[PDB]
Amino acid sequence: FRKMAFPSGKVEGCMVQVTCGTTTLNGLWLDDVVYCPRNVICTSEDMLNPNYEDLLIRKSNHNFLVQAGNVQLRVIGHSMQNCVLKLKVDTANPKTPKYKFVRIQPGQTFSVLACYNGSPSGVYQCAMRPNFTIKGSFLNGSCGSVGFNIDYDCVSFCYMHHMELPTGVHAGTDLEGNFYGPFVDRQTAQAAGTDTTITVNVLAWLYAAVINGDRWFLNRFTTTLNDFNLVAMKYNYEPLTQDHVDILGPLSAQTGIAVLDMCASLKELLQNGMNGRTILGSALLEDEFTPFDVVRQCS
Ligand SMILES: [Cl-]
């Protein structure tokens, strides 16, 4: 049961490289605007404690070298929107897809087109952790790469990678420059806080395991939401809400296993472990498939 990324074509024609000083990173070219992390304007000394307003005032349009494939895009304007830099250029991207900017919730998933210096290298499916970090070693060289979902014909951009925290975990913003989580684009000590397991996603993955024949872990017990959540808190699982129950509706309907029934099976797995067995070929419970993801990749 494999992670699936959205097809990346519509985003590939939007990826450009942005250089300021010694720093090159990735930028997103939509219409006549290139979006990228504002930390591109910082020198290594600047990053310790940048005044971005003052730094941005020192820069001129010619300080920003933007290139799409071959043609290099003349920057005719530079503006800051929270933590994203907006480089206005004199050419609208002819490959611009229908798109929207959306802010996602912790636990939601998205595809990242990982790029090096403007060039697409690969696509990865990830999740926004409960603590608003993104797990994924590939983001180390991919500053300015973006995360997205495709909803019908529209690319919904939800993430732009900005930095690694001193622990190594990855942090970024929505496309209007607001960080996910309590993080700032400054090179200083910053803690992400306890990450937890996305409970509703584990339940969705257990349903996928049932749909694919893997059902040894089903027991006959049931549970109430309150009793389950007491167990969940113990193992650093996120609390399950009635909204999460409703979202799991379609999967219960297809399988015939009520949601609280499945919660009782998960409780038993949390208390007892798997005793050396696997589920969907995994020895650990997977929490980076959403209920929508499982629905989409089953029928
Ligand atoms: Cl059960």
From Swiss-Prot:
There is a cross-link at K3, K88 (Glycyl lysine isopeptide (Lys-Gly) (interchain with G-Cter in ubiquitin)). It catalyses: TSAVLQ-|-SGFRK-NH2 and SGVTFQ-|-GKFKK the two peptides corresponding to the two self-cleavage sites of the SARS 3C-like proteinase are the two most reactive peptide substrates. The enzyme exhibits a strong preference for substrates containing Gln at P1 position and Leu at P2 position. Changing N140A: Does not affect ability to cleave and inactivate human TRMT1. It comes from the Viruses. Changing K88R: In strain: Beta/B.1.351. Residues 1-299 are cytoplasmic. It is found in: Host cytoplasm; Host Golgi apparatus; Host nucleus. The active site is at N39 (for 3cl-pro activity), C143 (for 3cl-pro activity). Inhibited by pyridone-containing alpha-ketoamides compounds 13a and 13b. In turn, alpha-ketoamide 13b (tert-butyl (1-((S)-1-(((S)-4-(benzylamino)-3,4-dioxo-1-((S)-2-oxopyrrolidin-3-yl)butan-2-yl)amino)-3-cyclopropyl-1-oxopropan-2-yl)-2-oxo-1,2-dihydropyridin-3-yl)carbamate) inhibits SARS-CoV-2 replication in human lung cells. Inhibited ex vivo by michael acceptor inhibitor N3. Inhibited ex vivo by compound 11a and 11b. Signal peptide: none annotated. Residues 1-299 form the Peptidase C30 domain. Cleaves the C-terminus of replicase polyprotein at 11 sites. Recognizes substrates containing the core sequence [ILMVF]-Q-|-[SGACN]. Cleaves and inactivates human TRMT1, preventing tRNA guanine(26)-dimethylation of tRNAs. May cleave human NLRP1 in lung epithelial cells, thereby activating the NLRP1 inflammasome pathway. May cleave human GSDMD, triggering alternative GSDME-mediated epithelial cell death upon activation of the NLRP1 inflammasome, which may enhance the release interleukins 1B, 6, 16 and 18. Also able to bind an ADP-ribose-1''-phosphate (ADRP). 3CL-PRO exists as monomer and homodimer. Only the homodimer shows catalytic activity. Interacts with host FBXO22; this interaction promotes the proteasomal degradation of nsp5. This is 3C-like proteinase nsp5. It comes from Severe acute respiratory syndrome coronavirus 2. The chain holds residues 3266 to 3564 of 4405 of the full protein.
